[PDB]
Ligand binder design. Structure first.
Ligand code: MG
Ligand code: ZN
Lengths: 21, 234, 83, 712, 698, 63, 225
């Protein structure tokens, strides 16, 4: 999540991005 | 509580046995609640008599026509179905009708036993010619609602016994429709409209009275659980 | 006469008015002139009555002069001269 | 009827309500009345209904594309701030409920109120003035509902089946009351083919004639109808005198029946009938079970085989190009043609797989919305997507929306979508300019008399013959032949007169003409009207909006201009620029020369510019045509183009678009009238819009009014 | 209107203004989508009106080169193996490269499974290429998309223009009072809410010392403590509330960058522009005809869809030639009940509810006296009316709104406050309305499926599942297949699955569809939240498998069958609906197109000076525009008298206007119209151009 | 010339009309609209505008 | 062909949920009977609710009480989920006073006699050392949903906060039918009607009120005689 207070959000993403927004 | 006005009924007749009822006005949303239940109760709660099975000499398996009378068997079964009868005794009464020679077979030629009546003797049924000899046996019994033809258990004993669908309900066709007259000043009430066609056996007014009675008894059977209750009053 | 009872603004059926007049514009001016006369009579009633005659049919409880005039046309109570 | 907000109605009728409320003594003076108006005291709401009672108020939506874009209504007060419309006038207003607002005006005087309640009443305007087809037709939801109610399902519950030896047919009903009694139970389904006895509805003409003989009075008598219960309910909805239809009702069928009603029934009854149709359509749309999900959209199993076959074709053509035997343009043309074939095959597979019961196919088939191309893009594959230059990308989107798309797949689609979304925005303004010019040029012509008593007119083909010998119907007769007036009597082989001069020339008249066998018919138009100012009523003919002869003061010019200009946003040179150039009478881009004299042709293939000479068949001189491009093809006639082929005085020797000035100067005014009318009509009809010929006739007549002076 | 609207107004690329082409100049080639846009500027997010294509948004990954050129990141592939090295590439060098695709079948080592991959070549073309020849690859999906559009679930299942409409309506949703986070979404909401700046964030890690409704104090590790003040009920530029609420406890520790207090349209720190509504997609009685929407009355009752609308009103006391206007509760010839809400200062008390026609500020101006008509003298003689030398140009609430009063700010020169020259007192008054949802208001999904509210229905008269739960909202089914936004139905199915929870039975391994489905997703509790990234989303097979196992709600009952449909009971007639219809949970938002702000009526108001036409717009009293097209329609009807009246005695004939008002009030027929004033203005105008134009009577 | 000037090329049309001293009969529909009299169409024609209505004598007697 | 009388029975599942069984009925009557009973239960069962409140430290809804983590609007929304029962019809006031650190629920409110608060554990607000909450609730009977009566409609002071009122003890009503539909026409509908109320009234008594309601209208229908 890389954000300390993020609520859990299960994802259907198959691939892992290299760099964050 | 108080409904702020007395809801009322206004009936106008259109034919000898056909009426329009206006129930006005109800609490918002009660038009459907009253109308659909009233329609169903009218259709399937009024007791009445109807024809159930027919047996006619001259046909055993030739289900096309019968000798003498020029019209065929499906026509005759339909004329017989559209015959209004009123029976007092619950057991299945048996009627007979016979004619000989050319002529016009109506309902008036029938002979009803005691306790049963036919409310339109002047109805055409058949047409005989050429030394025509017609004899019809009828079974009439009392029930309620509309019931499809039931397969006859006495097939071997009465091979010529053909069961028919039964129109037990005295009321033929009931439709209803809601409207929203006088909404703004009177905070959006609604009116309910009923169109009722019945057989000439009974009127629409007393049919409605009986339906209201049946619904009152049913919902009072429901209500007689906590006698002290709070609702709304006329 | 196969229709049911017309509701509201179309109370006098439009065709049953059309067969009484030459054309739609003629009917329009028909009704407009008659409404003018009726409103003049209503306004001036207290004073000396002029040639304008009130509604020949019975006006409703609170009925517009145009509606009264169109009822008059449907009842065949007035005559017109084309220009 | 139209529902009006009570607050806005109060603000609109303010002097009326204040006067009436000071009459009712709720206020002593107008100052007190104004205060209680501003504070909206409860003694104003009840008197508002009294004041609003049958006072016409006219609604409008911008843009007002045609005359029906602004219509009168009788208002009611509703709680809320939104104007409630009858769902039927939405087609006339081109108004969706996506957020569109509407404006409202109030007529004040007796004349204005009478005009609103007579001319502009919505119930008085059902048919479209442009083409006569009804505009108060049941739209999407109502057509869906009536299609569902009317369709007959084989092998359904409660069907009729004859039987013998053990039991009778056990499927026949005595009366519709018994039918609906059974339908209340599970015994009979609404869409079950049965035999019933009907006592009110008039039987169709065939059974009526063959059963009741001459006197076919149905409401008194009874007859056996072999139909479904839903069709009985629908015919019960229709007026009593209308014959029983007994057919599943598609949008076209509904159009035909409503048009027939408006043709031979009063306006009040057609309005009430259309209202009842709307009510039943809305009631039965909810029960059709039209719904959507992933399971509803289906995919064809042969899809991968088709795609593999066409991919192998693409690979082979790519390799053949890579050998250098063909250039890039040839490669692109080959790829486009094979992918068009692939789209065709996949669409056919989806069509042959999809059940006829599914909601999507039901909606498309019923004529309510969409089309099979929409369904193919949804489930199947979208196919070719446009270049931003308008060309076709060699690699099309292989998948469809159901399976999702790749990032680049969406991009190309976005290319195409943005192109279209900009072009429609430009198109709206262009069409507005066109109709603005048309109304100004054509505002002069108004109907001025009943008859100009002329005898000249126009020859209409009316279903030309066939070589085998038969009368094959002309495809465009409602546009050209219907609603006109005979200029000369119709005769067959100098025999009996079929239809007499000065006749409305409707369906019975055209049927009689075709029965007699004559095709060429002389008819009266505005092109030949001899009236000094405007046109006479008979020359203009039957007004398409009211179904009767036009009135004696109708401003037909504005009606024609609006009719032509209204569909301008649907067009997609071969489009709106084409019709604009036709109406502006410019030199067409594909200028195709025309012959000048009936004579023999001679062609020499010059260097990139041909040379065509026409030799007259008499002592006239030989005419030449030299400066033409080699890009344009050769016009076909008779067959094909051939050197030495004798051609007529005005044969288009090259395919393209001829020049109106040239065709006029070489074949008179009648020929240029024919050419302009046919060209504009075909440009419109290539998109699916029907407009009666008389409007374009009016505008062309206004074009050709002048004359150029040669000598002083 | 919301943090999305703010964040989209920033990071936006316009093409107008000085130095660029204008709307009068735009070319279709300019409006088109150039292939170089990929990853630089979004091709979906753009205004829909006449300026279509001239305004766009930066792609979510975009960057600006030092020279003003937009560049986007991309990974590089060497030896057919994708490195972790990221280089930013401008459209100049992209043509000199062959960039691969984001969602390519990588082998966890660097290689693609198929030799031929679909890529973009130099000239913007897309083609297949052997894997050993490509040199660049996309950093991720959604590289080509904006920030707003990236918040549309199942974007790839939506048509381009409908997705454009959805992205354009994402930024018009008003902030409700709750802002529940969507059941189905994308991962972009968290970062959007963080970067929009509308959510308070802990700038230094530490414990939380004390929390109230206005301030939050944090005890940092290094001795110092910090206080975050929280803005409450502040009116935004478009008249919507900007309330902020804490989401923390009194003892919990927070890290740097963590959300402390959520904002207007946020929940737990992620953007939430609407509410999850239980939806059925069947047509109902024609009230949802042609894109109309039906709702239950419980949405009104429970305040599921309601909004706070704060409006400010200004009035200034300024010096004038005759003296100084003064704001005072003493205002001549006024009643007392309307003065009850006015304090001694002359301004309405805070909290005093107000309605149309009332006085907010009693400001009285020095006029002296004018022509005193005989009747005024007679009146002051008969009753005893005094001099009343002053005039009352008091602040009155504009026509057509009401509500409570939040607060007042008062500026004066006697308090050192800097004011415009000539003004000695300034007063601004803030009025709030808790606007409930009503018919005529505009609702929309995230997929461009907008519509107004046809009818609010009583909760009893709504289709309800076998469990007895009524549906909340009904949309027509004819609007979906025609517009190609099946993605909204995909969202409906996934929303029902996420609302009900699920468990894939791994008795004998996982099923085939769940082989590639990620772990921790095989089992979800009720009311879970799922994220569907726009292009690496949830496949149809995965969604179908999820719908298969949809563990029952309260007792043993699977209301929604395998194909996503369910059996409904008609709430009006009671009989079950003959066929199952699809039901689910859909995210519905209320757009800023409330009927209260769009209702206008005019009987008689102001007129312009040069020509006596009525004014236009709700700011003035309005008056509708009868244009040339409407004139054409009126002539087409052949209706002449109403045209005469619409042009003469309603817009220009001044004597006609006054006489018609007198006639209508008194009860006589309308008089004959005269000559419009605009024609006389034209006549004098042409005369002033040295043109001898006149009118001849015979 | 009033119609033409309201239509298009207004300066050119006005200049030509002023030079030629052209006169407008004010009989066209557009100029009737622009000056505010009844248009010569529909209910604006003489035969429809000058119809006279009077009660029929049986109805007047029955009043 | 059944002529035996219809009858009713009760089956309690929870303290709130219950299941009423009606049998035997006419074929097809069960669905419409259940629908009418549901439409009445869900709409016209009288109850009691809070209509207006007042806090000493505030004047309108869009402010904040100093000290309490909660907001005034969100306090109103939390208080919206109160379940009460009144026995006296007239407007009745109940008080809530709290001070010091802690979390105030619906158990801290002292009701007067003759009224009952039924979910004392439901959360209202959270205070601090500076927190101090003092609110008064005015509770009225009625039925259905009534929006906020305007402050100027009554002789109300500035500080009075009108609130929406929902007098409806019925939480969720549904039904099902079991139809025999046998060949010998001895076919009847058994109607199962499950009702859940919000802990204020027994579903038995809610049904009693609904039936007493319907009886008046249908008696007006029948008395036509
Ligand atoms: Mg629209
Ligand atoms: Zn003519």
């Amino acid at each position: 999540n890389s954000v300390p207070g993020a609520p859990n959000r299960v994802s259907f993403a198959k691939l892992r991005e290299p760099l964050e927004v | 509580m108080l409904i702020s006005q007395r809801p009322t009924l206004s009936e106008d007749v259109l034919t000898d046995n056909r009426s329009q009822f206006v129930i006005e006005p109800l609490e918002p949303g009660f038009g459907y609640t009253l109308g659909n239940s009233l329609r169903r109760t009218l259709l399937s709660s009024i007791p009445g008599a109807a024809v159930t099975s027919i047996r006619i000499d001259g046909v055993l398996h030739e289900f096309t026509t019968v000798p003498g009378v020029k019209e065929d068997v499906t026509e005759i079964i339909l004329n017989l179905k559209s015959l209004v009868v009123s029976s007092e005794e619950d057991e299945p009464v048996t009627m007979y009708l016979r004619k000989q020679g050319p002529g016009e077979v109506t309902a008036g030629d029938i002979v009803p036993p005691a306790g049963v009546t036919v409310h339109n003797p002047g109805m055409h049924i058949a047409t005989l010619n050429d030394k025509g000899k017609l004899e019809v046996e009828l079974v009439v019994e009392r029930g309620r609602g509309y019931v499809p033809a039931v397969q006859n258990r006495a097939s071997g004993a009465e091979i010529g016994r053909i069961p028919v669908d039964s129109i037990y309900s005295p009321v033929l066709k009931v439709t209803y429709k809601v409207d929203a007259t006088r909404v703004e000043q009177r905070t959006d009430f609604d009116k309910l409209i009923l169109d009722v066609e019945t057989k000439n056996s009974i009127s629409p007014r007393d049919a409605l009275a009986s339906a209201g009675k049946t619904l009152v008894e049913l919902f009072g059977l429901a209500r007689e659980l906590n006698v002290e209750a709070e609702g709304i009053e006329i | 006469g196969g229709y049911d009872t017309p509701l509201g603004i179309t109370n006098p059926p439009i065709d049953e008015l059309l067969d009484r007049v030459s054309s739609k514009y003629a009917l329009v001016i028909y009704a407009a002139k008659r409404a003018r006369q009726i409103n003049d009579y209503y306004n001036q009633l207290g004073e000396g009555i002029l040639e304008y005659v009130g509604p020949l049919v019975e006006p409703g409880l609170q009925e517009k002069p145009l509606s009264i005039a169109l009822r008059e046309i449907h009842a065949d109570l007035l005559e017109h001269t084309e220009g | 009827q139209c529902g009006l907000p009570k607050l806005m109605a109060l603000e609109l009728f303010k002097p009326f309500v204040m006067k009436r409320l000071v009459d009712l003594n709720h206020a002593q003076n107008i100052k007190s009345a104004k205060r209680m108006v501003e504070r909206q005291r409860p003694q104003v709401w009840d008197v508002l209904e009294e004041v609003i009672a049958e006072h016409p108020v006219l609604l409008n939506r911008a843009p007002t594309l045609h005359r029906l874009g602004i219509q009168a209504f009788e208002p009611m007060l509703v709680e809320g701030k939104a104007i409630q419309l009858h769902p039927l006038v939405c087609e006339a207003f081109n108004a969706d409920f996506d957020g569109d607002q509407m404006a409202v005006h109030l007529p004040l005087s007796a004349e204005a109120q009478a005009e609103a309640r007579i001319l502009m009443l919505s119930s008085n305007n059902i048919l479209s003035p442009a083409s006569g087809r009804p505009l108060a037709m049941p739209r999407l939801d109502m057509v869906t509902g009536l299609y569902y109610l009317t369709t007959e399902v084989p092998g359904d519950t409660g069907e009729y089946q004859p039987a013998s030896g053990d039991h009778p047919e056990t499927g026949v009903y005595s009366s519709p009351a018994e039918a609906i009694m059974a339908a209340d139970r599970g015994v009979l389904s609404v869409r079950a083919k049965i035999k019933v006895r009907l006592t009110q509805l008039r039987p169709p003409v065939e059974i009526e004639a063959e059963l009741f003989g001459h006197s076919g009075w149905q409401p008194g008598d009874a007859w056996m109808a072999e139909t479904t219960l839903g069709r009985v309910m629908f015919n019960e909805l229709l007026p009593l005198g209308y014959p029983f239809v007994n057919k599943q009702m598609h949008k076209k069928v509904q159009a035909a029946i409503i048009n027939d009603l408006a043709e031979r029934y009063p306006m009040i009854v057609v309005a009430q009938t259309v209202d009842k149709l709307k009510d039943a359509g809305f009631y039965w749309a909810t029960r059709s079970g039209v719904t959507v999900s992933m399971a509803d959209v289906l995919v064809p199993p042969r899809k991968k085989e088709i795609l593999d076959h066409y991919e192998e074709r693409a690979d082979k053509v790519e390799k053949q190009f890579q050998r250098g035997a063909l250039n890039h343009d040839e490669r692109n043309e080959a790829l486009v043609e094979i992918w068009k074939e692939a789209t065709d095959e996949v669409g056919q597979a989806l069509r042959e797989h999809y059940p006829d019961d599914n909601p999507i196919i039901t909606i498309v088939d019923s004529g309510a919305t969409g089309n099979f191309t929409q369904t193919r893009t949804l489930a199947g594959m979208k196919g070719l997507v446009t270049n931003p230059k308008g060309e076709f990308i060699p690699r099309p989107v292989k998948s469809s929306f159901r399976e999702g798309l790749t990032v680049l797949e969406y991009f190309i689609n976005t290319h195409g979508a943005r192109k279209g979304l900009a072009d429609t925005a430009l198109r709206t303004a262009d069409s507005g300019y066109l109709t603005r010019r048309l109304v100004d040029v054509s505002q002069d012509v108004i109907v001025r008399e009943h008859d100009c008593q002329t005898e000249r007119g126009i020859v209409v083909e009316l279903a030309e013959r066939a070589p085998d010998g038969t009368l094959i119907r002309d495809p465009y007769i409602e546009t050209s032949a219907y609603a006109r007036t005979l200029g000369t009597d119709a005769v067959d082989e100098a025999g009996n007169v079929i239809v007499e001069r000065g006749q409305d020339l409707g369906d019975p008249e055209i049927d009689a003409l075709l029965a007699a066998g004559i095709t060429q018919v002389k008819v009266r138009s505005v092109l030949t009207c001899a009236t000094s100012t405007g046109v006479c009523a008979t020359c203009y003919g039957r007004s398409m909006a009211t179904g009767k002869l036009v009135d004696i003061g109708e401003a037909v010019g504005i009606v024609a201009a609006q009719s032509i200009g209204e569909p301008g946003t649907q067009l997609t040179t071969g489009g709106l620029p084409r019709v604009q150039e036709l109406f502006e009478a410019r030199v067409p881009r594909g200028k195709a020369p025309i012959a000048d004299v009936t004579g023999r042709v001679r062609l020499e293939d010059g260097e990139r510019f041909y040379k065509i000479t026409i030799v007259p068949d008499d002592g006239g001189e030989e005419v030449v045509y030299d400066k033409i491009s080699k890009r344009q093809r050769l016009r076909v006639f008779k067959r094909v183009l051939s050197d030495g082929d004798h051609v007529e005085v005005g044969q288009q020797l090259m395919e393209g678009s001829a020049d109106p000035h040239e065709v006029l100067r070489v074949q008179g005014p009648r020929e240029v009238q024919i050419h302009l009318v046919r060209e504009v009509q075909e440009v419109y009809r290539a998109q699916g819009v029907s407009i009666h010929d008389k409007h374009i006739e009016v505008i062309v007549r206004q074009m050709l009014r002048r004359v150029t002076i040669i000598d002083s | 209107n919301n943090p999305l609207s703010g964040l989209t107004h920033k990071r936006r690329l316009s093409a107008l203004g000085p130095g660029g082409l204008s709307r009068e100049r735009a070319g279709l080639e300019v409006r088109d989508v150039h292939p170089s846009h990929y990853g630089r500027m979004c091709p979906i997010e753009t205004p829909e009106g006449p300026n279509i294509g001239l305004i766009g948004s930066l792609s979510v990954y975009a960057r600006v080169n030092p020279f003003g050129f937009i560049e986007t990141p991309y990974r590089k592939v060497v030896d057919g193996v994708v490195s972790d090295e990221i280089v930013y590439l401008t459209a100049d060098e992209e043509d000199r490269h062959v960039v691969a695709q984001a969602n390519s079948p990588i082998d966890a080592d660097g290689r693609f499974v198929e030799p031929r991959v679909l890529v973009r070549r130099k000239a913007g073309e897309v083609e297949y290429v052997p894997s050993s020849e490509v040199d660049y690859m996309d950093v991720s999906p959604r590289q080509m998309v904006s920030v707003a559009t990236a918040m549309i679930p199942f974007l790839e299942h939506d048509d381009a223009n409908r997705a454009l409409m959805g992205a354009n309506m994402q930024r018009q949703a008003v902030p409700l009072v709750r802002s529940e986070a969507p059941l189905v979404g994308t991962g972009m909401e968290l970062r959007a809410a963080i970067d929009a700046g509308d959510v308070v964030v802990a700038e230094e890690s530490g414990v939380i010392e004390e929390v109230s409704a206005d301030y939050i104090t944090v005890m940092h590790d290094n001795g110092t403590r910090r206080t975050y003040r929280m803005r409450k009920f502040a009116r935004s530029n478009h008249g919507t509330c900007a309330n902020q609420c804490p989401i923390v406890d009194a003892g919990d520790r927070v890290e740097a960058g963590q959300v402390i207090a959520d904002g207007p349209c946020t929940d737990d720190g992620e953007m939430a522009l609407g509410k999850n509504l239980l939806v059925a997609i069947m047509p109902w009685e024609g009230h949802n005809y042609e894109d109309a929407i039906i709702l239950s009355n419980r949405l009104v009752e429970e305040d599921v869809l309601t909004s706070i609308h704060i409006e400010e009103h200004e009035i200034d006391a300024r010096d004038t030639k005759l003296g100084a206007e003064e704001i005072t509760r003493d205002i001549p010839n006024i009643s007392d009940e309307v003065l009850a809400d006015l304090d001694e200062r002359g301004i309405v008390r805070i909290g005093a509810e107000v309605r149309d026609g009332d006085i907010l500020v009693g400001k009285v101006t020095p006029k002296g006296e004018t022509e005193l008509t005989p009747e005024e003298r007679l009146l002051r003689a008969i009753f005893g009316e005094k001099a009343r030398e002053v005039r009352d140009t008091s602040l009155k609430v504009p026509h057509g709104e009401s509500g409570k009063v939040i607060g007042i700010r008062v500026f004066s020169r006697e308090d050192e406050d800097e004011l415009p020259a000539g003004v000695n007192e300034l007063v601004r008054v803030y009025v709030a309305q808790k606007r409930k949802i009503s018919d005529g208001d505009k609702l929309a999904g995230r997929h461009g499926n907008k519509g107004v509210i046809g009818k609010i229905l009583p909760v009893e008269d709504m289709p309800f599942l076998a469990d007895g739960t009524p549906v909340d909202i009904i949309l027509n089914t004819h609007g979906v297949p025609r517009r190609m936004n099946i993605g909204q139905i995909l969202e409906t199915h996934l929303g029902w699955c996420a609302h009900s929870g699920w468990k894939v039975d791994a008795a004998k391994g996982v099923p085939d569809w769940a082989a590639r489905l990620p772990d921790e997703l095989l089992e979800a509790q009720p009311n879970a939240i799922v994220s569907t990234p726009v292009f690496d989303g949830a496949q149809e097979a995965e969604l179908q498998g999820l719908l298969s196992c949809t563990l029952p709600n309260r007792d043993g009952d699977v209301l929604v069958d395998a194909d996503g449909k369910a059996m409904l009971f008609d709430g009006r007639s009671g009989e079950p609906f003959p066929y199952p219809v699809t039901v689910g949970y859909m995210y519905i938002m209320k757009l800023h197109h409330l009927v209260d702000d769009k209702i206008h009526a005019r009987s008689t108001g102001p007129y312009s000076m040069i020509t006596q036409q009525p004014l236009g717009g709700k700011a003035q009293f309005g008056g509708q525009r009868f244009g040339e097209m409407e004139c054409w329609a009126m002539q087409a009807y052949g209706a002449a008298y109403t045209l005469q009246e619409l042009l003469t005695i309603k817009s220009d004939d001044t004597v006609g206007r006054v006489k018609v008002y007198e006639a209508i009030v008194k009860g006589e027929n309308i008089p004959e119209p005269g000559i419009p004033e605009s024609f006389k203005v034209l006549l004098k105008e042409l005369q002033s151009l040295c043109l001898n134009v006149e009118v001849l009577s015979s | 010339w009033l119609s033409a000037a309201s239509f298009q090329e207004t300066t050119r049309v006005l200049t030509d009309a002023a030079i030629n001293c052209r006169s407008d009969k004010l009989n066209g529909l557009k100029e009737n609209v622009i000056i505010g009299k009844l248009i010569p169409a529909g209910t604006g024609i003489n035969r429809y505008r000058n119809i006279a209505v009077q009660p029929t004598e049986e109805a007047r007697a029955a009043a």
